């Protein structure tokens, strides 16, 4: 049965002078009394796990433009605002979780570059405009870099139609729609050096020519074995060298498995839970040295059975700070210790 402990130290309170501590949650958590109380106990930022992505906000199109469905997303923003916490908007532009009809006209034909850029402006103006003043940070563009490409750009439909200018224009238009939102470029695998370098140069070049980008989001979807905390620190050191860029750790989780491993556990091995705890302690000890630039650290889920990694890899995993029964893990105590 459920074993939440309402009296153990609050995560965000323990880091209140360092950075916000956030959590990604799906809509079901907003209507579950235990989930809601746990979110508000420990976190001073939330991200909608899926409900603010393009496929969630888009309802359809006609020959005059886009139709939207905002009711569920409104609940997330209202929940954050009424409870005096931040909400990170995730995410305006992404090759995933956007319907393919978004790249087509009302007769099924692929949009031209000019027509797609006009649609991008409409989408950003409508979505960012609706939530103007209420969303402190947006992931404006998610995962636009692919280090396997010689020029570093992911060959998504966005890129195939627009070339790389869709990225800078997304930031320009989001900043017009809400000039006080902090605008982030968000990505994973920042500890692959070639990818780090593409991300660094892209953001630095945008910034140096006056594009309104304010931050880099390091997703930090990691595991107990890789990458090292030192390599995460190397990413922070390089990205923080760009003037006017802050850093959010946006989607932190730590699988118990090596990547591509066929290990599959029914219950979490204690040795791996301890390795996880040690690494989370090391990670937060390092992040605390960089509070001049790291302003928010969000975990990609509330508790282990809610983790996207279970569906992603088709097996049980224990990547977060709370067990399935809401009780604290070794990792939780390690994060408190590091504070
Ligand atoms: O049915 C749907 C349902 O699908 C949907 O589900 C939601 C989907 O969105 C979820 O939210 C998103 C999750 O995170 C971001 O997107 C993903 C980020 O992760 C990408 O995958 C990453 C791939 O790289 C892995 O790292 C590897 C580690 O190993 C490295 O190699 C080392 C090298 O050194 C050696 O020594 C080591 O042995 C060796 O292992 C590799 O180089 C490196 O690649 C990462 O671990 C892994 O994370 C993934 O492709 C992205 O998609 C998004 O931003 C975020 O939105 C959401 O949570 C789900 O709920 O929900 C609705 C249903 O209707
Ligand atoms: O000790 S370690 O070697 O691990 C990292 C030391 N390093 C020195 C510079 N600061 C920022 C100074 S400031 O932004 O507050 O002025 C971040 C961390």
Domain spans in the chain, listed from the N-terminal domain onward:
1-339
Question: What angle, rounded to 10 degrees, do the helices at 229-239 and 193-208 form?
Answer: 20
Distance of CA 266 to the CA centre of its chain: 28
CA geometry: angle at 213 spanning 99 and 112, to 5°?
A: 40
The fold of 1-339 is: TIM Barrel (3.20.20)
Mutate to test the pocket of ligand 2, among 289, 293, 294 (most ligand atoms within 8 A of CB): 289
DSSP-derived secondary structure letter, 109: P
Taking alpha carbons only, the member of 170, 334, 338, 136 closest to residue 248 is: 136
Q: How far is the CA of 289 from the centre of ligand 2 (A)?
A: 6
Cβ atoms within 10 Å of 262's Cβ, excluding its own: 7
Segment holding 287, helix H or strand E: helix 270-287
Cα separation, 326 vs 218, in Å, equals 26
Segment holding 296, helix H or strand E: strand 294-299
Count Cα atoms within 13 angstroms, Cβ side, for 27. 11
Residue matched to tokens 């224009």: 169
Q: Is the CB of 290 under 6 A from ligand 2?
A: yes
Cα separation, 21 vs 86, in Å, equals 10
Question: What angle, rounded to 10 degrees, do the helices at 270-287 and 229-239 form?
Answer: 30
Sequence-ordered list of residues with C-beta below 8 angstroms from that of 323, at least 6 positions apart, any chain: 303, 304, 329
Cα separation, 216 vs 190, in Å, equals 10
Cα separation, 6 vs 33, in Å, equals 13
- Report the structure determination method: X-ray
CA geometry: angle at 322 spanning 317 and 323, to 5°?
A: 55
CA geometry: angle at 76 spanning 166 and 335, to 5°?
A: 90
Residue 103 three-state SS: helix
Q: How far is the CA of 47 from the centre of ligand 1 (A)?
A: 17
């Amino acid at each position: 049965d459920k074993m939440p402990d309402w009296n153990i130290p609050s995560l965000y309170e323990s880091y209140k002078n360092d950075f916000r501590i956030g959590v990604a949650i799906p809509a079901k958590c907003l209507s579950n009394d235990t989930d809601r109380r746990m979110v508000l106990k420990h976190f001073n930022s939330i991200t909608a796990e899926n409900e603010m992505k393009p496929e969630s906000l888009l309802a359809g199109q006609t020959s005059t433009g886009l139709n939207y469905r905002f009711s569920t997303a409104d609940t997330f923003v209202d929940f954050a605002n009424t409870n005096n916490i931040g909400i990170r908007g995730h995410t305006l532009v992404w090759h995933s979780q956007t319907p393919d009809w978004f790249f087509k006209d009302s007769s099924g034909q692929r949009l031209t570059k000019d027509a797609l850029l006009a649609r991008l402006k409409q989408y950003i103006y409508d979505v960012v405009g609706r939530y103007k003043g209420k969303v402190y940070a947006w992931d404006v563009v998610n995962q636009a870099i692919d280090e396997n490409q010689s020029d570093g750009y992911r060959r998504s439909t966005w890129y195939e139609i627009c070339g790389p200018e869709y990225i800078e224009k997304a930031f320009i238009w989001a900043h017009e729609a809400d000039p006080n939102a902090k605008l982030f470029y968000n990505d994973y695998n920042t500890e692959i050096s070639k990818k780090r370098d593409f991300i660094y140069n892209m953001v630095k070049n945008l910034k140096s020519k006056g594009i309104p980008i304010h931050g880099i989001g390091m997703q930090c979807h990691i595991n107990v074995n890789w990458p090292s905390v030192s390599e995460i620190e190397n990413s922070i050191k390089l990205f923080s060298s760009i003037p006017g860029i802050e850093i959010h750790i946006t989607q932190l989780d730590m699988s118990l498995y090596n990547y591509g491993s066929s290990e599959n556990y029914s219950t979490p091995p204690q040795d791996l839970l301890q390795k996880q705890a040690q690494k989370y302690k090391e990670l937060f000890t390092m992040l605390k040295k960089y509070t001049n630039v790291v302003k928010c650290v969000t975990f990609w889920g509330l508790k282990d059975d809610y983790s996207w990694l279970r569906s992603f890899n088709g097996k049980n995993d224990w990547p977060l700070l709370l067990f399935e029964d809401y009780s604290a893990k070794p990792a939780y105590w390690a994060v408190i210790e590091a504070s």
